[PDB]
Amino acid sequence: VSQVRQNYHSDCEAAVNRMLNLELYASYTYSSMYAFFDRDDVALHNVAEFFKEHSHEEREHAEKFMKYQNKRGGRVVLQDIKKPERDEWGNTLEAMQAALQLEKTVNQALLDLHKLATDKVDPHLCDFLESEYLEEQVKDIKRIGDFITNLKRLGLPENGMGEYLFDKHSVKES
Amino acid sequence: VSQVRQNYHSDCEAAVNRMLNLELYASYTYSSMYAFFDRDDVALHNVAEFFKEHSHEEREHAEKFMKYQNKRGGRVVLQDIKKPERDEWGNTLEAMQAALQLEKTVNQALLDLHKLATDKVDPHLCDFLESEYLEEQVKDIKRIGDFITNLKRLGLPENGMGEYLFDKHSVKES
Amino acid sequence: VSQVRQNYHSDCEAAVNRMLNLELYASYTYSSMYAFFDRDDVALHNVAEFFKEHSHEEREHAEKFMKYQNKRGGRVVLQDIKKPERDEWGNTLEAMQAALQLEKTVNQALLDLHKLATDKVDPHLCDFLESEYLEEQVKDIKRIGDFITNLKRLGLPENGMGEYLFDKHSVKES
Amino acid sequence: VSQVRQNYHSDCEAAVNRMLNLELYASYTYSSMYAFFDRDDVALHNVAEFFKEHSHEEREHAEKFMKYQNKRGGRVVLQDIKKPERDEWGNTLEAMQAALQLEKTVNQALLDLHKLATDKVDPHLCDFLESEYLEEQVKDIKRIGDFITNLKRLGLPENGMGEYLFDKHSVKES
Ligand SMILES: [Cl-]
Ligand SMILES: [Cl-]
Ligand SMILES: [Cl-]
Ligand SMILES: [Cl-]
Ligand SMILES: [Cl-]
Ligand SMILES: [Cl-]
Ligand SMILES: [Cl-]
Ligand SMILES: [Cl-]
Ligand SMILES: [Cl-]
Ligand SMILES: [Cl-]
Ligand SMILES: [Cl-]
Ligand SMILES: [Cl-]
Ligand SMILES: [Cl-]
Ligand SMILES: [Cl-]
Ligand SMILES: [Cl-]
Ligand SMILES: [Cl-]
Ligand SMILES: [Cl-]
Ligand SMILES: [Cl-]
Ligand SMILES: [Cl-]
Ligand SMILES: [Cl-]
Ligand SMILES: [Cl-]
Ligand SMILES: [Cl-]
Ligand SMILES: [Cl-]
Ligand SMILES: [Cl-]
Ligand SMILES: [Cl-]
Ligand SMILES: [Cl-]
Ligand SMILES: [Cl-]
Ligand SMILES: [Cl-]
Ligand SMILES: [Cl-]
Ligand SMILES: [Cl-]
Ligand SMILES: [Cl-]
Ligand SMILES: [Cl-]
Ligand SMILES: [Cl-]
Ligand SMILES: [Cl-]
Ligand SMILES: [Cl-]
Ligand SMILES: [Cl-]
Ligand SMILES: [Cl-]
Ligand SMILES: [Cl-]
Ligand SMILES: [Cl-]
Ligand SMILES: [Cl-]
Ligand SMILES: [Cl-]
Ligand SMILES: [Cl-]
Ligand SMILES: [Cl-]
Ligand SMILES: [Cl-]
Ligand SMILES: [Cl-]
Ligand SMILES: [Cl-]
Ligand SMILES: [Cl-]
Ligand SMILES: [Cl-]
Ligand SMILES: [Cl-]
Ligand SMILES: [Cl-]
Ligand SMILES: [Cl-]
Ligand SMILES: [Cl-]
Ligand SMILES: [Cl-]
Ligand SMILES: [Cl-]
Ligand SMILES: [Cl-]
Ligand SMILES: [Cl-]
Ligand SMILES: [Mg+2]
Ligand SMILES: [Mg+2]
Ligand SMILES: [Mg+2]
Ligand SMILES: [Mg+2]
Ligand SMILES: [Mg+2]
Ligand SMILES: [Mg+2]
Ligand SMILES: [Mg+2]
Ligand SMILES: [Mg+2]
Ligand SMILES: [Mg+2]
Ligand SMILES: [Mg+2]
Ligand SMILES: [Mg+2]
Ligand SMILES: [Mg+2]
Ligand SMILES: [Mg+2]
Ligand SMILES: [Mg+2]
Ligand SMILES: [Mg+2]
Ligand SMILES: [Mg+2]
Ligand SMILES: [Mg+2]
Ligand SMILES: [Mg+2]
Ligand SMILES: [Mg+2]
Ligand SMILES: [Mg+2]
Ligand SMILES: [Mg+2]
Ligand SMILES: [Mg+2]
Ligand SMILES: [Mg+2]
Ligand SMILES: [Mg+2]
Ligand SMILES: [Mg+2]
Ligand SMILES: [Mg+2]
Ligand SMILES: [Mg+2]
Ligand SMILES: [Mg+2]
Ligand SMILES: [Mg+2]
Ligand SMILES: [Mg+2]
């Protein structure tokens, strides 16, 4: 047993490792989206940079779980990071829809981890999730939903001018 | 009788209370418009912020009537603030048309109060309305009319790209 | 269903709308207290400004619930804002006693909403209440209790000099 | 006829001269109050300075009427400035009550001049009164009413401690 360990259930330790992997998976999917929008035959560079920044955010969130694991006396166990579900992402609307689904998948895993922490009476882990993950998750889901609404308004997928305008006005100039 | 009261007719005192309520009503309608444009399935955030700022303006105008009432020795009497006429506002054009009508309703009430103050020979109340309300009212009506003209030019309600562009270019970046 | 909605119960959505209304109601009551203490025959201007600032605080708290509702994919539904229970507030002690009761009423509604969020296993809503409402509520209740103790010490309601001194020393100079 | 004169009735010219005299009279009354509160057996120096400043304000308002008269092509005609009604002013409450009455007397004369200007269809004179006199008059009446309420609260005339405290807290430190 780790000398620092106190009130940390084996099930929670394992679930933190699984959440670490999921964050890395999400990061990798966002990196794929970045590379797609950077292609010469796609060429939406502000959209590309949006996804690159999100990839970096998810990687940081994975690192936070590593640090958390060690703070509680658990042990980081890594698994393969699976490649993303697609090799090409269609267009800005398809990519944003996939991003929304990914953020909701990550959110569900966070909520499930909170339920486990609650069941095992681990208020430190509950606080960590609530203070570092759950609200930023809701914000990202809202942002992407707002984007999807605007992409539909702009006539995606058919309206190329609409897609061009989204890249200039909806995502930050990079 | 209030020790400060001089040349202040009971009818004007009552009409100031009614105008106070109308300003609060207008504020609440603008707050509803803010919340509508902030919805994930509407997502026109500069339009939303425009209406939020107008809600704040109307609330300040209500407060100015409270202060006025007390300065003249009248007594503030509050009534329920009725909820807005609609729960959802359609789109930017429908909302701006409702805003135009609301501003003209408020303007008519101000003009009617000026007529009453004139009838009761109350130059202080006339000056207050002319100096603090009537010109800013004309400016707001002109602004909203200009917006409606541009929304029609942009092809509202059908043209979603037009609506998107209005939010980026016609209202201030928030 | 809203595309952003996840783990958000209809009961919680409805209760957030009711809490929004209660915050608006509280704001309106504080505005009435402001106007009362601004009367020429009351004339306790620092007390008046204290209540004006609290009215603004409650209005901001209502707006935060609107934003919250939309972030979760719920829909803001507004109702009439009922006028305050009294048209005149007696004196500083009576007003502070009414304020204490109002803050405890709002606190109970927040605690009841937390119980509902707990029952529906909504940790995001629990965190929102704990992080944005519950502690500031306890602070406001403590502040007003402290004031009431001092008003009694100063001989309210009978001791007019005591009431005058409270306005100069206990509430911020406005 | 003055080469600049246009739309300026003889009655209004005469009434402006009478208003000039009344402002000088009011100034002189406030100077008497200053001297009273500066007495070694009264010795309320912030109250004294309040009245001194008001004397200066009224003198400036008289000068503004002189300038106005000449701008319109009327002719300034001066009369004796009558001494104040009292040689001694009792205490802070009695003096403030006399000040309230004086400000309401001046206000009535301003309102009567506005009625005359209205009857003679002189919008320039109406504007001058509304823009330079009527609102500042309402503010001064409200201020003095507020003071009287507080002096009564503080137990004037009997409560000397109350009177002492008013001088320290209600009027500006001089
Ligand atoms: Cl353990
Ligand atoms: Cl334990
Ligand atoms: Cl264990
Ligand atoms: Cl593991
Ligand atoms: Cl894993
Ligand atoms: Cl593996
Ligand atoms: Cl596998
Ligand atoms: Cl996919
Ligand atoms: Cl693919
Ligand atoms: Cl997914
Ligand atoms: Cl889990
Ligand atoms: Cl968070
Ligand atoms: Cl957006
Ligand atoms: Cl957008
Ligand atoms: Cl009257
Ligand atoms: Cl009159
Ligand atoms: Cl009347
Ligand atoms: Cl009324
Ligand atoms: Cl009303
Ligand atoms: Cl009512
Ligand atoms: Cl009704
Ligand atoms: Cl409507
Ligand atoms: Cl509706
Ligand atoms: Cl209307
Ligand atoms: Cl009216
Ligand atoms: Cl104006
Ligand atoms: Cl325009
Ligand atoms: Cl425009
Ligand atoms: Cl849900
Ligand atoms: Cl869940
Ligand atoms: Cl549900
Ligand atoms: Cl509801
Ligand atoms: Cl409600
Ligand atoms: Cl209702
Ligand atoms: Cl009801
Ligand atoms: Cl009550
Ligand atoms: Cl009452
Ligand atoms: Cl209550
Ligand atoms: Cl509830
Ligand atoms: Cl808090
Ligand atoms: Cl205290
Ligand atoms: Cl205190
Ligand atoms: Cl002439
Ligand atoms: Cl003419
Ligand atoms: Cl003439
Ligand atoms: Cl003359
Ligand atoms: Cl004269
Ligand atoms: Cl003479
Ligand atoms: Cl004489
Ligand atoms: Cl006298
Ligand atoms: Cl005398
Ligand atoms: Cl007089
Ligand atoms: Cl006259
Ligand atoms: Cl003025
Ligand atoms: Cl005062
Ligand atoms: Cl005072
Ligand atoms: Mg060891
Ligand atoms: Mg284990
Ligand atoms: Mg494989
Ligand atoms: Mg937080
Ligand atoms: Mg985030
Ligand atoms: Mg995220
Ligand atoms: Mg996240
Ligand atoms: Mg009275
Ligand atoms: Mg009446
Ligand atoms: Mg109704
Ligand atoms: Mg004017
Ligand atoms: Mg103006
Ligand atoms: Mg305006
Ligand atoms: Mg307006
Ligand atoms: Mg207006
Ligand atoms: Mg949908
Ligand atoms: Mg429902
Ligand atoms: Mg009722
Ligand atoms: Mg906190
Ligand atoms: Mg607070
Ligand atoms: Mg509170
Ligand atoms: Mg609170
Ligand atoms: Mg000549
Ligand atoms: Mg003449
Ligand atoms: Mg004489
Ligand atoms: Mg006029
Ligand atoms: Mg003015
Ligand atoms: Mg003045
Ligand atoms: Mg004056
Ligand atoms: Mg004056």
Is C23 annotated among the ligand-binding residues? yes
Q: Token pair of C171, please? A: 């509430």
What is the phi/psi pair of residue C81, to 5°?
A: -95, 110
Q: Which of B2, B3, B127 sits opposite D135 (nearest CB)?
A: B127
Max CA distance (Å), chain A: 61
What is the phi/psi pair of residue B81, to 5°?
A: -95, 110
Closest CA to C76 of C88, C87, C66, C63: C66
Closest CA to A147 of A102, A91, A105, A97: A97
Question: B46 to chain A: which residues are within 8 Å by CB?
Answer: none
Type of residue found at C76: V
Closest CA to C124 of C73, C59, C61: C73
B to C contact (≥3 Cβ pairs closer than 8 Å): yes
Q: Which experimental approach was used here?
A: X-ray
3-state SS track over chain D: CCCCCCCCCHHHHHHHHHHHHHHHHHHHHHHHHHHHHCCCCCCCHHHHHHHHHHHHHHHHHHHHHHHHHHHHCCCCCCCCCCCCCCCCCCCHHHHHHHHHHHHHHHHHHHHHHHHHHHHCCCHHHHHHHHHHHHHHHHHHHHHHHHHHHHHHHCCCCCCHHHHHHHHHHCCCCC
CB D128 within 8 A of CB D68: yes
Q: In which element (H, E) is residue A6 found?
A: none
CB B44 within 8 A of CB B58: no
Query: Structural domain tally of chain A?
Result: 1
What is the phi/psi pair of residue B83, to 5°?
A: -65, 155
How far apart are the C-alpha atoms of D86 and D63, rounded to whole Å? Answer: 25
Angle at D76 between CA D71 and CA D81, to 5 degrees: 135
**Domain limits for position B128:** 1-174
Q: Token pair of C83, please? A: 């006028």
Q: Token pair of C6, please? A: 């996840």
Angle at B121 between CA B116 and CA B122, to 5 degrees: 80
**Neighbors of chain A with 3 or more C-beta pairs under 8 Å:** B, C
The conformation of residue A129, written as its DSSP 8-state character, comes to H
Q: In which element (H, E) is residue B1 found?
A: none
Chain D closest-CA separation from residue B57 CA (Å): 23
D to A contact (≥3 Cβ pairs closer than 8 Å): no
* Resolution for this PDB entry, in angstroms: 1.2
How far apart are the C-alpha atoms of C80 and D114, rounded to whole Å? Answer: 43
How far apart are the C-alpha atoms of D33 and C63, rounded to whole Å? Answer: 52
Question: A97 to chain B: which residues are within 8 Å by CB?
Answer: none
In Å, how far are B156, C97, D91 from D38, measured between CA atoms? 73, 42, 12
DSSP B69-87: HHHHT-------BPPPS-S
The conformation of residue B89, written as its DSSP 8-state character, comes to -
CB A113 within 8 A of CB A129: yes
Closest CA to B144 of B39, B26, B12, B8: B26
H runs (alpha helix) in A38-132: 45-72, 92-119, 123-129
Q: Which residues pair with B81 in a beta bridge?
A: C81
How far apart are the C-alpha atoms of B23 and D17, rounded to whole Å? Answer: 42
CB B62 within 8 A of CB B109: no
Question: B41 to chain A: which residues are within 8 Å by CB?
Answer: 145, 149
How far apart are the C-alpha atoms of B61 and B59, rounded to whole Å? Answer: 5
CA torsion sign for B50, B51, B56, B62 is positive
How far apart are the C-alpha atoms of C36 and B76, rounded to whole Å? Answer: 8
Asked whether the bond before B157 is cis by omega within 30 degrees of 0, the reply is yes
Q: Which of A107, A130, A141 sits opposite C127 (nearest CB)?
A: A130
Type of residue found at B88: E
CATH of the domain at C61: 1.20.1260.10
Asked whether the bond before C84 is cis by omega within 30 degrees of 0, the reply is no
At A122, is the secondary structure helix, strand, or coil?
coil
Rg of chain A over all Cα atoms, to the nearest angstrom: 18
* Residue whose pair of structure tokens reads 């009455």 in the numeric block: D101
B160–A152 C-beta distance less than 8 A: yes
CB A17 within 8 A of CB A77: yes
DSSP C3-49: TT--S--HHHHHHHHHHHHHHHHHHHHHHHHHHHHTSTTT--HHHHH
Is A135 annotated among the ligand-binding residues? no
Q: Which of D129, D130, D142 sits opposite B4 (nearest CB)?
A: D142
How far apart are the C-alpha atoms of D28 and D16, rounded to whole Å? Answer: 19
